[model samples]
Target: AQVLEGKTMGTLWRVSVVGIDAKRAAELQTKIQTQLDADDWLLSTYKNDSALMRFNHSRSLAPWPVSEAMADIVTSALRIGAKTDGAMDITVGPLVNLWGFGPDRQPLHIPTPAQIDAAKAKTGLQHLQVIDRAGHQFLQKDLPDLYVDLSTVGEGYAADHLARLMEQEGIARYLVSVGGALSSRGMNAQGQPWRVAIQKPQAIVDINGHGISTSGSYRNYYELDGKRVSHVIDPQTGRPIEHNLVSVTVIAPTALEADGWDTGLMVLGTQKAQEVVRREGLAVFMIMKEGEGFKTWMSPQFKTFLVSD
Candidate 1:
């Protein structure tokens, strides 16, 4: 087994492959870095010159031409956004920034009710659309103040792109990951399918030619109103969620889908997420805090992937 690693989108990316020597690994390393760098430049909010940023800063009510990748990513975001009943919004950046989770600020105090309302006014899945014409792509926005954040699904898309890169290079078996998003196919060095594990519930999933992502609500929080306020803001309320859902892990055909679903499920409490999982026949595992110890649950689809429930 050989492993290649690099950094992207403020997180590490790793590629594990079978039967590759140092020379090939070196070439792969370069290719992997270049590919991920392109992914970053396309989707990163940190880069002002990024393709996503350009559209975000533009005040155009006219259809904005964008890369095919950008159009596809936002298309999936909109689809998933509607599927999750707008809980998985890419246009929720204003509220995220208002609550001090984004690059905009660290709020001085708890946002006022009117402040929350103002932020909410700037966000909606309905305001954005993706148009395709003779393979030319464009993103049109009705709301000029609307800010789109793809970070929630961008890492997933990044990891899946690496998987495609591996297939293009004729790698038969490999595991590729970007940040929390992972995509894998074929067997490990041990001649078995790649296994993915969730942190809280501790279940091993046999992920063959599939993508997986885990979203946890426990991290990146602050104290406000004598309660822990997480960075994940609920789209319906325009405030951070107060729920017992500690973590959510989802598996899909692509890491992009998994990444997108996990964030939406993370924001929804257990019951609501469960409703979605069942309706979509989604493979999902979740852990919720129950007094002192944590309680775990998995959908029927998730159980099929498990080495242990």
Candidate 2:
């Protein structure tokens, strides 16, 4: 087996594989890095001239030309945004920026009601549109103030893309992770399914042929009035989410979906998140902060992935 790791998209990515030698591992690592770099250029908000930024900066309501990859990502984000009832909105960037979570990195302060309302005016998945032209694609926004941020699903998509890249290279048994999102195929060198751990629950799960993602307020947050203000904003409210739900993990057929769901469910809180999990028949695990302790919940499908003691 071979292991390779590097930094990309503002986070560390790790790859593990069986049935590959040192030379092949180095070559594959380069390939994966190249792919992630290309994706970052297309998707990153921190980059001034990124494809998504170019569109966001444009005021014209015309169909803005974009790479197929950009179009596909927007399409997927819009789809999942709808599924999650707009909780996973890419157009929520305006609020994200106002809350000091976006690339601007504005100072954290309690936004006034009028300021929140102004940011809310610029957000909504409905304002952005994806156009699929014959043999080409484009993105358009109805509101010039609209901003798009792919940070929610970007890492997951990168992880899944790397997994496919491995498969294309005839490497069936591999685990690929970008940022914290993970995807795995076949088995490890020990001929066992790839396993991962949920932090708060302190439980391990087999993740073969599935993508796993977790979204939480634990890592990225601000302290205000002796309260933890999460970076995960609720688009409808134009404010950072204030809830007991600390983290939510989701497993899906693809890393992109898992990533999208984790963010959406985290913003939805426990009861609503559980409702979506049951309605969609999704595999989801949630950890809620209760006083100084914590509470855990998992959907029926999620239980199957848990490793029994």
Candidate 3:
């Protein structure tokens, strides 16, 4: 039997399971919610007294579960960070916050040099330390006001968790989207790659721009003194990046990795970013801010991922 049940965990969730009766699907739904409430539970705020929140606030100089996860994801972020040469930095939480891009702040103007320096002092992958698999859930060193933000990895982690649960429920095939990030496995009822539309960075929320992810600076911006300000801030300058490229949709083996990588490559700029994608066999489509028009580029494999009419 193919059973469908739904649950909400921070975000709405729908469960679809085959080989299970409706009753079993309902039970699985409850079970999935329980797991989400436990593991996917994150700090409500950076200042909260919750164990996880405290861990982020205190930098886990002692020991914390978040310290363990942070250690693990930081390793992941660092791998891509080095691979992208600091484009997708794990140490930019301070920078993200300073520019008002974080929960604590809203983008308004730029920060002072002293403020930027203070944030930079606390910002750097080199300052972070972790011990994995072992019972030592610790930061290994002490640093002032260091915080860990898991915005990038949280969705992927959640998606992977849900996927695993569905698999446990005897669901061998499905497509699941937790947020903007999603994962697809096996064939749909039609025997095709799940057609997921990557959002365009344009202000218009229309889905017509590009069928693939088109992320860039064209979205989330503010105008100040006749100058446009974007949310994609550069950690080095403590300000938004100025680039002619608007967005880039990168098609990869997994949506989780692709989500994080798109941000990295977009921050890396068009030319070099395209090179990286091509060299690595990643399918990517890039849109640039050409004068009076927009330019587009896509890798050879991008067409392979596209759905045919």
TM-score of each: 0.94, 0.94, 0.76
The deviation in Å at residue 262 for candidate 2 is 1.0
Give the lDDT of residue 304 in candidate 2.
92
> Model 2 — which ten-residue stretch has the worst lDDT?
218-227
> Candidate 3 residues 62-173, lDDT tens each?
5444455445555666676777767766667787788776667574765888888888777766666665656655444366566655555455555556777777767776
For each candidate, what is the lDDT? 0.87, 0.86, 0.59
Put down candidate 1 lDDT per residue, 124-160, tens digits, no spaces: 9989999998969999999999899998999999999
RMSD of every prediction: 2.8, 2.5, 5.6
Given candidate 1, what's the lDDT at residue 135? 67
Highest lDDT among the candidates is held by which one?
Answer: 1
Error of 3 at 149 (Å): 1.6
Report model 1's TM-score to 2 decimal places: 0.94
- When summed lDDT is taken over every stretch of 10 residues in candidate 3, the lowest stretch is 203-212
Write out the backbone clash pairs for model 1: none
